[PDB]
Design a protein around this ligand. Structure first.
Ligand SMILES: [Zn+2]
Length: 204
């Protein structure tokens, strides 16, 4: 796990969260798996239907799933979302809710992508990575690949644990895209390192 230091919330802080749209099913599932973080981190997510929430969540279809890093949400205008879930519906399984709700709420806590960990040096087969992401279903450009995959953060701007391949913040990496046989599977729950690291970041 790795957190951008400048995006960290004050420890023990209660973060207001607003849900805008979504079915009762999707909404309850978002809250259910978001509050999973509070079992290990000294951070509370307060889901509200009142006031001006610090975290604002939408469900705009096709817009992808994302979130701003921690307190970056403060810079965002009140008429915009800080977090969006792009593919949920009333047929979404618990495994999928767990995999991406926890992950985007990990971003909301200040955590980056684990494949961009400051201690890592993942053996990308760069040409094959470019080739795959250039086509369906991502259609990414060179700037997209270089910034979202290849680039890593620095140890100076981040508070980090050891590189964790099982982290909820680690994207799947196929052995077909590496030069090493190295591969990362599908992580859909909080890893042991996750629970430990987010505890050191927001300790009790
Ligand atoms: Zn992410």
């Amino acid at each position: 796990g790795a957190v951008v230091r400048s995006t960290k919330w004050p420890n023990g802080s209660v973060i207001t969260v607003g849900l805008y749209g979504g079915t009762p099913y999707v909404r309850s599932k978002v809250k259910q798996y978001a509050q999973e973080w509070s079992n290990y981190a000294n951070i509370t997510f307060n889901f509200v239907e009142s006031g001006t929430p610090q975290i604002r969540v939408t469900f705009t279809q096709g817009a992808g799933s994302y979130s701003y890093l921690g307190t970056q949400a403060l810079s965002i205008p009140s008429n915009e979302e800080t977090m969006n879930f792009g593919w949920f519906d009333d047929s979404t399984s618990d495994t999928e809710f767990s995999r991406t709700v926890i992950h985007e709420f990990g971003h909301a806590l200040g955590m980056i992508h684990e494949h961009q960990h400051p201690l890592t040096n993942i053996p990308w087969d760069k040409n094959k990575v470019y080739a795959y992401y250039a086509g369906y279903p991502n259609y990414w450009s060179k700037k997209d690949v270089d910034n979202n995959l290849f680039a890593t953060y620095s140890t100076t701007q981040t508070q980090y644990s050891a590189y964790d391949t099982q982290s909820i913040m680690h994207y799947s990496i196929s052995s077909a895209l590496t030069t090493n046989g190295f591969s990362v599977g599908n992580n859909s729950v909080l890893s042991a390192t996750d629970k430990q690291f987010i505890a050191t970041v927001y300790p009790r």
